[PDB]
């Protein structure tokens, strides 16, 4: 189970695992009491004739309209229907689950004044496995996406339950749940915050961080394949800049290659060159240092590791927040109108994640050109075609795939968090587009795994050609796992399925994404 | 003076001020001894027949060429000429100064093995006020820019000295300095790192952080102008999300507006609406909460403040680093080939700064539409034209300026740190473009001040129209300073010069940028 207790923050790793595995939510007692008290406070404010948005006023474009408390249910049902205007394909079950868990987390903090009955119902709908159909396109940053959920919670719209699409009412009946009856604030509290962009955003972070870690082992395997030198990865020289991500990356690679005899000892190369010295300017077959896609790996992936730490922190904070409006402070029993639904932090974080993904993409696209071009590959056969070159083209065509997906990805990396357009009579006049920002990352992550897959495919074929006796233990593990999906290739063969296989099996944890 | 002492890190604020003011560099004794020892170690390595890039090998495309120690001077002079291939307009004096101070900082750490004589000469050339002419376009991320400097240091190329452009040799003679004589490694050590993108990058950070701080007071003045409510800025509701930049932004605005009577007390508005309540659905002239460009200001500028903290840290770390190759560790007397010249951290930081600038731009462009459109301005006259509307157009045309520069800026925000193209026989196969990334930020910052200038111009005219008796102390200070440059406008007048004046005098610290 995914346990929510008061004041204990939820980690990205926990919510990603809960959403991938459909872990049930369980609540600590104090969470129940806080959610309940928040509603009691609101009710007492309504008796005190407080004026509160979405309780006795209308919303969005009609912010200035008074609406009687007696008409609450009807206003809340109108609200969740009116803003459910997303279109296009439906989110997968894992993203839907993550979204609803992020909403449950936000509401659990006791500042939203959702009733305890509807809060438990939201959890129960989640627990029993109902997955509202959430159309992916539209929304300003997540009314659309969350209103698709609120509608299913009330016995409307559509959902998947046990592998079948059916009406919201059919799914509730099958799951054994009565639909929610919404009173004042309640529609608003279920739909007014950042939970879709968070739910998608967290699942993307978790996937990316995992792929990054794996890619340091793909890198180490490349370096063995290219006979790159390991001395530039020594932690001692990286402690000469205070960048933390760089020093971590170099340390991991350095430790992974410590027992390789494929990776090259710079001191051995230095000796070869010193022995050629005779007081003349002349060319050598050896070179004291390698090309940047090898030697600059820590300086290039270090910023990626560091921007991942910052993204993790922003997502963690946005997940562990009261992203809803208005909000009730239980200590002072005060109500605040505020802007906590605004997704700018997540949207910005997504644009940074997009940039990080394309930076990794360029690196791996460039590794691939090192393997393909015999002038760059440090003694490997052209196109890694070891037998019958000319009669066969070898792996030359994989680069047609990667350079194209890299180019497409570079063109797709325009920041969404700056694209704000004003709507709703200019009430929503500056908006994040955080969920579009996250959907665009998701596309770029698919691209990244394709290009990674071909670097790894190259690296395996390259070490086969070098001889694998000298592989490090950790890189040999990766080489082995890949060799269970793709053979050494001594004849020309379509690699489309091989690449899909490595992407799916080596480079993926969350297969729904 | 700008004092360099061993192991004490230099702050961005100090190097920005040194570069703006042409503070002289002074050295702590230990820095002198460390720089000297680094050279002695290298010399002893050369005697030991070590093979070291740029000392007895050639560089870039000719990495694999052995070059005799006897030919060192000639190789280093060839190197600084061959890579000085920048074109276009010359960097201003402040950016040039910052660049050379960042280089001096990097070399001061004692890992570069530049001679103590050439190190002191670099400082002396800086101190006496010689400013090498550095063409801004070109370079992969800063051989071009730093080789323009290295050439002037050796009595070549061109420089500005005492307000005149002249040859490098003329400027040295006038300043009383003998040109540098370069021995092995020395050309390479002067040009091989990140100092131009750092020098520009730091000057941009400092300017931006200052403009941000000022813009929180421009915001507070806007909110007074628009009669926005201050309750959504209360720190208590912002502590309901753990985002630090957001809570800081709201706190600053909340404290700045504490003594305003122009900004609106939400409780007063709540009372007005409660008094209109009569059990019917109906429209009110009052609304319990405001549009996002007012109420979401902390949620929008908070990510900007937070990404500024991360940028500050990356720049601080890159400034306080040994960004040079190869490097000597003095403890173990070991030499490392490495990738520490790679600007990926700065280039990525610049792309984030670009995004932050456009996010602020959208916000202020949107504030401007609140002032211009009487449906949005909460009781201000259309286009802030209080007298003779129709006969006069008022300030309506300023928005033609800002929407255009905002649109242009949005189109210019494609990340440069992903644009890598391979060169140099694929030795430089993955590159940062960090200096282009910084130059593009610089352009966006000019744009930002134009749009800010018109928001502030609007805000002043708006509070004049409200009556300024109720201004907060801090916002009245800003209103006053602006009113020394631009009057209240009761007739139609070209604002081009007014806007330039506010940009230059209110919104600028570093006038060279
Ligand atoms: N997200 C709500 C606005 C607010 O909370 O200030 C909203 C906006 C538009 C329509 C319904 C609800
Ligand atoms: N920046 C140098 C390369 C290295 O240090 O590895 C370089 C690159 C090209 C030409 C000259 C020097």
Automatic annotation (TrEMBL), chains A, B:
InterPro entries: Aromatic_Lyase (IPR001106), Fumarase/histidase_N (IPR024083), L-Aspartase-like (IPR008948), Phe_D_beta_mut (IPR031007). This is AdmH. Pfam families: Lyase_aromatic (PF00221). Transmembrane segments: none annotated. Gene3D superfamilies: Fumarase/aspartase (Central domain), Fumarase/aspartase (N-terminal domain). CDD domains: PAL-HAL. One of its GO terms (molecular function) is ammonia-lyase activity.
């Amino acid at each position: 189970s995914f346990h929510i207790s008061s004041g204990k923050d939820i980690s990205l790793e926990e919510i990603a695992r809960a959403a991938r595995d459909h872990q049930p939510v369980t609540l600590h007692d104090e969470v129940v009491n806080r959610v309940t008290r928040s509603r009691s406070i609101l009710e007492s404010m309504v008796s005190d004739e407080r004026v509160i948005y979405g309780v006795n006023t209308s919303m969005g474009g009609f912010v200035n309209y008074i609406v009687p408390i007696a008409k609450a249910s009807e206003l809340q049902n109108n609200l969740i229907n009116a803003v459910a205007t997303n279109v296009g394909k439906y989110f997968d079950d894992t993203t839907v689950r993550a979204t609803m868990l992020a909403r449950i987390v936000s509401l659990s903090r006791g500042n939203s004044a959702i009733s305890i009955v509807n809060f438990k119902k939201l959890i129960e709908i989640y627990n029993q496995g109902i997955v509202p159909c959430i159309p992916e396109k539209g929304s300003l940053g997540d009314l659309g996406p969350l209103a698709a959920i609120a509608l299913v919670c009330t016995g409307q719209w559509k959902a998947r339950y046990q592998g079948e699409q059916m009406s919201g009412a059919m799914a509730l009946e099958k799951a054994g749940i009565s639909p929610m009856e919404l009173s004042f604030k309640e529609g608003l509290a279920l739909i007014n915050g950042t939970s879709a962009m968070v739910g998608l955003g967290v699942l993307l972070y978790d996937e990316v961080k995992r792929l990054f870690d794996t890619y340091l082992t793909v890198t180490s395997l490349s370096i063995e394949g290219l006979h790159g030198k390991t001395k530039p990865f020594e932690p001692a020289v990286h402690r000469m800049k205070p960048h933390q991500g760089q020093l971590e990356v170099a340390t991991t690679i350095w430790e992974t290659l410590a027992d390789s005899s494929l990776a090259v000892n710079e001191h051995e190369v230095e000796k070869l060159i010193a022995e050629e010295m005779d007081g003349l300017v002349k060319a050598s077959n050896h070179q004291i240092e390698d090309a940047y896609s090898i030697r600059c790996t820590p300086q290039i992936l270090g910023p990626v590791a560091d921007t991942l730490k910052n993204i993790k922190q922003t997502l963690t904070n946005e997940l562990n927040s009261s992203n809803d409006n208005p909000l009730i402070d239980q200590t002072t029993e005060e109500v605040f109108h505020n802007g906590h639904f605004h997704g700018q932090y997540v949207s910005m974080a997504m644009d940074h994640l997009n940039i990080a993904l394309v930076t990794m993409m360029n690196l791996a696209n460039r590794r691939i050109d090192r393997f393909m071009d015999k002038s760059n590959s440090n003694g490997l056969p052209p196109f890694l075609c070891a037998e019958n070159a000319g009669l066969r083209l070898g792996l030359m065509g994989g680069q047609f795939m990667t350079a194209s997906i890299t180019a497409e990805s570079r063109a797709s990396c325009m920041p969404m968090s700056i694209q704000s357009l004003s709507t709703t009579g200019d009430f929503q006049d500056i908006v994040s587009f955080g969920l579009v920002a996250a959907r665009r990352v998701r596309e770029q992550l698919k691209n990244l795994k394709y290009v990674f897959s071909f670097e790894l495919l190259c690296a395996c074929q390259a070490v086969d050609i070098r001889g694998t006796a000298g592989l490090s233990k950790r890189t040999r593990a990766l080489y082995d796992k890949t060799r269970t999906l793709v053979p050494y290739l001594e004849e020309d063969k379509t690699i489309s399925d091989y690449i899909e296989s490595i992407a799916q099996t080596v480079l993926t944890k969350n297969s729904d994404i």
